[PDB]
Design a protein around this ligand. Structure first.
Ligand SMILES: [Mg+2]
Ligand SMILES: [Mg+2]
Ligand SMILES: [Mg+2]
Ligand SMILES: [Mg+2]
Ligand SMILES: [Mg+2]
Ligand SMILES: [Mg+2]
Ligand SMILES: [Mg+2]
Ligand SMILES: [Mg+2]
Ligand SMILES: [Mg+2]
Ligand SMILES: [Mg+2]
Ligand SMILES: [Mg+2]
Ligand SMILES: [Mg+2]
Ligand SMILES: [Mg+2]
Ligand SMILES: [Mg+2]
Ligand SMILES: [Mg+2]
Ligand SMILES: [Mg+2]
Ligand SMILES: [Mg+2]
Ligand SMILES: [Mg+2]
Ligand SMILES: [Mg+2]
Ligand SMILES: [Mg+2]
Ligand SMILES: [Mg+2]
Ligand SMILES: [Mg+2]
Ligand SMILES: [Mg+2]
Ligand SMILES: [Mg+2]
Ligand SMILES: [Mg+2]
Ligand SMILES: [Mg+2]
Ligand SMILES: [Mg+2]
Ligand SMILES: [Mg+2]
Ligand SMILES: [Mg+2]
Ligand SMILES: [Mg+2]
Ligand SMILES: [Mg+2]
Ligand SMILES: [Mg+2]
Ligand SMILES: [Mg+2]
Ligand SMILES: [Mg+2]
Ligand SMILES: [Mg+2]
Ligand SMILES: [Mg+2]
Ligand SMILES: [Mg+2]
Ligand SMILES: [Mg+2]
Ligand SMILES: [Mg+2]
Ligand SMILES: [Mg+2]
Ligand SMILES: [Mg+2]
Ligand SMILES: [Mg+2]
Ligand SMILES: [Mg+2]
Ligand SMILES: [Mg+2]
Ligand SMILES: [Mg+2]
Ligand SMILES: [Zn+2]
Lengths: 60, 204, 74, 147, 96, 123
RNA sequence: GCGAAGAACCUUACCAGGUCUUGACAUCCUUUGACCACUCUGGAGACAGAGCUUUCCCGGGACAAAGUGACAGGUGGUGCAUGGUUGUCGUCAGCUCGUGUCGUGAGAUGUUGGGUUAAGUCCCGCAACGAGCGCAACCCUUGAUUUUAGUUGCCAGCAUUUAGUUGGGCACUCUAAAGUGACUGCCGGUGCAAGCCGGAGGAAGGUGGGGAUGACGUCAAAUCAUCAUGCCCCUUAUGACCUGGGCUACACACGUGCUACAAUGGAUGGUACAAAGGGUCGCGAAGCCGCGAGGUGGAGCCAAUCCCAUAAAACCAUUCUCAGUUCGGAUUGUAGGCUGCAACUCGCCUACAUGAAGCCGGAAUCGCUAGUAAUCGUGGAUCAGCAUGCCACGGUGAAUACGU
């Protein structure tokens, strides 16, 4: 009971409240940063390789 | 203690990002495409030794210059795949897709290509120690100041997993001016997962 | 709605009670001043606990009366 | 610190009657960054101690110096697989540090209503060679007298 | 009497690009309001390291936006003609 | 003159005059209630004998009430010295041309505060 | 105060009841063509039944409906089978190689010995002489300063308005690109030297303060529940759809926080000084109705301009006068506001009322060496709504280090 539910995230529900957000590569429900639509683990794994522009490691 | 990704912390100090495309409130649409327009290119031209696909977009038109070690395979006398992939890339990005290949030099310096020389061989049931050492010495002739190939996993068909590697020369990671490459591929053997890791110090 | 600009029953409990035991399935549909004298059956996650809407228990959410956790001593 | 000694600072001469025995006891007064609460109090205590006693507020405040400064601090020396009470001679560190600690640690014993006079009464009380702060000094030397 | 705003992630690419149009502005018109800095936006994303527990290990990325704006004081007909004819490095932001 | 301390900055113009140390388009005793902390501001004018010889104009931005007191002291101590170089041989010794380098500290992840940490219990 | 950077529903993996079979969801094919969307009845909906109906484009092309299967479909098992990704020892100072030399040999020396250091850092002495990954340095931010560009920031010279408002100027600040500056550099003692004790000068003095960076490897350490994968099991159910419910239950024991037990305080009025961030289908001002939480209204803004946004501790006057109180605020009744189809189980807040334990905490135990601890506020991520938690920002600012 996992790949069934991505269709539940995708389809427009009968109430705006039902609708939530999940990662757009691996459908992880928690911790999805809206400026990217990526979960925490997708977001970091692309930043190292460097797909996300602008983002870089912040010493300070 | 686990290392850092020797690319993931060189970005923006000695190396740019694999995508140069500014966006204002439209990043989520552009960024998700800059992760899938790099997947159709990943399988369609899988055997053409493609290393970097730097997507740059501007003015409702996208440019994806694919850098390959076999430049004549993607484009050239046939003149068909470039036109053929112009249909597939544009059928996804819903706009112009201008691709201009870049021809690699000193092929044993691109880590992705260098570790695919040891990722197919290991999948063809060869020796772990021989596979790395036969090519570690091979690329060492090119001019790399260092090397480190490791083949980590349930190596050798055993029931207990262990790590193996090699090296030759200088490869200072903790110096930020090092031009160090890196790659990591999946040796999808018939029995499990064994992914290799390769990286190459270079000129300066 | 705790706001004074509203007072809602589910969609049909009022309709079925309007003509008219009663078994309104879910919950949540506070007994208005038009249902005293018509016993309903508000479901409880299992079984249908029977409650008779009197004049005193008017306004309260229909669910309250049927408990949900069975705790018969420690 | 497992490596040598260190030297301390505690030095900022105060605005009125510039000294470092009055910017100290004004720093051993405050709680959670309340320099302003203490500084006014530590100058109002002088105001009542300069009237009800007559003499100079500074000399009256320093009059209770020799009546609060400890002389022998019973040290906890490790002998025979335990700790005992081996008296020793306190240095200048534990003289003024202890000495000005004795007052404020005994500011619940003046029994007034406000700290403006309570700190003013205790300084005079020790300045009379009486009160509890001097008794506390004599109490410490008493347990140091046994050993 | 125009105003152009530059918004690029790397200060090297934009400040070089602005050093080009500011030169072309001088040829088009002596009265040029040269490049000028504005405070740079910073944002931080404190993503957590471990795939599972160990709540005390995270890793912080950042994303700047270096800004610069160029204007015109008493422009001429060359300004409208000679401005749009340039393409800047991909990343530089143009808005007149 | 110009003097910083903590997050507050004070820029000082010093001209000969009566001696009214004005601050930020208001009288200083209005602007600072506790005059006893305002006497140190006269240290750059009492260590060199120029107490009531110049009227001090000040501009104030940021910090806290004690935050400017350290900056205005420094902010004039770099101007009285510039009036005549004879003032440096004593204004550069009392600790006035020095700029206090202490500032607040970043908060590091895994820690409640900058240097604090959670509470520790073994078992 | 752990995955969970948001458990009313959804998320939800769990229970009860009710429903589907090539399946809700992909690829192979055929007959239809662009399929949908909409109204009426029943139901808790999942779903059934009626109607207009979806007017494709250029034989081909995308997308769809209907017809049997190959198949799908598993947040089902094994982290003592794995990729990964991580943690702790630990930012501890180690792990090695080439040429020589000793040993029959595995091997040793270098890397031991005396000092010194934060450090196999550095020196001296020795059958060793050198070197590589680690330490230090390169990188980021803060502390002084030069040049450049001066607006939307700044306002001295000039006046002008209730107001930096207006002309006007980039002087000062400040913003941000390229540079300077600190290295035991100089002087005294000491040392053979490394270095150690002190002094000038300088914004800054002994790696100035703080980040990023984590060697060889240890724990068969954590995760098959992020993704992927070896092998096994279910495959008209261990798959799939809905409504309700549990995830918040309570006789108790333990971990991390919040608020207090009062006079360095409470109550009332006045009143002053921030830093860092967020805003387009978003921030939402002024006025107006309100004790009230809020509602109506729509100004300005794709922002150094406008908004979120009046910061509180501090301070100045009156009152309280050492009481379970003019402290404390749990608990409960009534009456209300917000979002959302819906606040009963189970959200947040407001008024009146109610007013409980607590009068500085046993043996024991925790954090921190300076802008530190303590204490008072603000912003962001997730987010229709909900944080005493988490990630960041500032204001007030201490005490002691003899010693192992
Ligand atoms: Mg939600
Ligand atoms: Mg190993
Ligand atoms: Mg590197
Ligand atoms: Mg029980
Ligand atoms: Mg780490
Ligand atoms: Mg000087
Ligand atoms: Mg710490
Ligand atoms: Mg938990
Ligand atoms: Mg495993
Ligand atoms: Mg386990
Ligand atoms: Mg730790
Ligand atoms: Mg031999
Ligand atoms: Mg060793
Ligand atoms: Mg070290
Ligand atoms: Mg280092
Ligand atoms: Mg520095
Ligand atoms: Mg300058
Ligand atoms: Mg200038
Ligand atoms: Mg010195
Ligand atoms: Mg340092
Ligand atoms: Mg550091
Ligand atoms: Mg760290
Ligand atoms: Mg092991
Ligand atoms: Mg293991
Ligand atoms: Mg264990
Ligand atoms: Mg599991
Ligand atoms: Mg994966
Ligand atoms: Mg993947
Ligand atoms: Mg829970
Ligand atoms: Mg809860
Ligand atoms: Mg506890
Ligand atoms: Mg108190
Ligand atoms: Mg209170
Ligand atoms: Mg700000
Ligand atoms: Mg408050
Ligand atoms: Mg307070
Ligand atoms: Mg009260
Ligand atoms: Mg009660
Ligand atoms: Mg009650
Ligand atoms: Mg009562
Ligand atoms: Mg009360
Ligand atoms: Mg009660
Ligand atoms: Mg320490
Ligand atoms: Mg954000
Ligand atoms: Mg929580
Ligand atoms: Zn993901």
């Amino acid at each position: 009971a996992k790949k069934s539910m991505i269709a539940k995230q995708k389809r427009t529900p009968k109430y705006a409240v039902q609708a939530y957000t999940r990662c757009e590569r691996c459908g992880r429900p928690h911790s999805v940063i809206r400026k990217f639509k990526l979960c925490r683990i997708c977001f970091r794994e692309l930043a190292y390789k460097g797909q996300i522009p602008g983002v870089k490691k912040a010493s300070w | 203690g686990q290392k850092v990704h020797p690319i993931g912390m060189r970005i923006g100090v000695i190396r740019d990002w694999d995508s140069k495309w500014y966006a204002e409130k439209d990043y989520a649409d552009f960024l998700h495409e800059d992760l899938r327009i790099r997947d159709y290119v990943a399988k369609r031209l899988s055997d053409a030794s493609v290393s970097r696909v730097e997507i740059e977009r501007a003015a409702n038109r996208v440019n994806i210059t694919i850098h390959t070690a076999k430049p004549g395979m993607v484009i050239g006398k046939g003149g068909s795949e470039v036109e053929a992939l112009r249909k597939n890339l544009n059928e996804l990005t819903q706009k112009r897709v201008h691709i201009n290949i870049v021809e690699i030099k000193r092929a044993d310096l691109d880590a992705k290509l260098v570790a695919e020389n040891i990722a197919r061989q290991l999948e063809g049931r060869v020796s772990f120690r021989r596979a790395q050492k036969q090519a570690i010495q091979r690329t060492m002739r090119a001019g790399a100041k260092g090397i480190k190939t490791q083949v980590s996993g349930r190596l050798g068909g055993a029931d207990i997993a262990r790590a193996e590697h090699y090296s030759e020369g200088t490869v200072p990671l903790h110096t930020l001016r090092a031009d160090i490459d890196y790659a990591w591929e999946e040796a999808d053997t018939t029995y499990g997962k064994l992914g290799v890791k390769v990286w190459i110090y270079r000129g300066e | 709605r705790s706001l004074k600009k509203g007072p809602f029953v589910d969609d049909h409990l009022m309709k079925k009670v309007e003509a008219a035991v009663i078994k309104t399935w879910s919950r949540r549909s506070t007994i208005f001043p038009t249902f005293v004298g018509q016993t309903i059956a508000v479901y409880d996650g299992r079984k249908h606990v029977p409650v008779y809407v009197q004049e005193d228990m008017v306004g309260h959410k229909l669910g309250e009366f049927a408990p949900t956790r069975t705790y018969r001593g420690h | 610190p497992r490596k040598g000694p260190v030297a301390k600072r505690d030095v900022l001469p105060d605005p009125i009657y510039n000294s470092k025995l009055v910017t100290r006891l004004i720093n051993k007064m405050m709680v959670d960054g309340k320099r302003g609460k203490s500084q006014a109090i530590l100058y109002s205590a002088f105001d009542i101690i300069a009237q009800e006693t007559g003499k100079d507020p500074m000399e009256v405040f320093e009059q209770a110096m020799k009546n609060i400064m400890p002389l022998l601090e019973v040290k906890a020396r490790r002998v025979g697989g335990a700790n005992y009470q081996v008296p020793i001679e306190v240095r200048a560190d534990r003289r003024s540090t202890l000495g000005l600690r004795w007052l404020v640690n005994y500011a619940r014993l003046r029994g007034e209503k406000t700290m403006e006079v309570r700190v003013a009464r205790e300084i005079m009380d020790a300045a009379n060679n009486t009160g509890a702060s001097v008794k506390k000094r004599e109490d410490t030397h008493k347990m140091a007298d046994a050993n | 009497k125009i105003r152009i705003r530059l918004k690029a992630y790397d200060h090297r690419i934009l400040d070089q690009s602005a050093e080009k149009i500011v030169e072309t502005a001088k040829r088009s018109g002596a009265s040029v309001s040269g490049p000028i800095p504005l405070p740079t936006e910073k944002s931080i994303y404190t993503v957590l390291r471990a795939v599972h527990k160990y709540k005390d290990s995270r890793e912080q990325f950042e994303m700047r936006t270096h800004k610069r704006l160029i204007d015109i004081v008493n422009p001429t007909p060359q300004t409208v003609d000679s401005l749009m004819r340039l393409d800047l490095p991909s990343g530089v932001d143009i808005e007149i | 003159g110009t003097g910083r301390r903590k997050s507050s900055v004070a820029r000082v113009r010093l001209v000969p005059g009566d001696g009214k140390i004005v601050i930020n388009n208001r009288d200083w005793e209005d602007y600072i209630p506790f005059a006893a902390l305002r006497e140190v501001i006269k240290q750059p004018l009492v260590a060199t004998e120029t107490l009531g010889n110049y009227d001090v104009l000040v501009n104030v931005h940021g910090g806290g009430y004690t935050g400017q007191a350290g900056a205005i002291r420094h902010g004039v101590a770099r101007a009285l010295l510039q009036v005549a170089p004879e003032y440096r041989p004593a204004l550069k010794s009392a600790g006035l041309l020095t700029r206090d380098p202490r500032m607040k500290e970043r908060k590091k992840y895994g820690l409640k505060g900058a240097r604090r940490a959670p509470q520790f219990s073994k078992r």
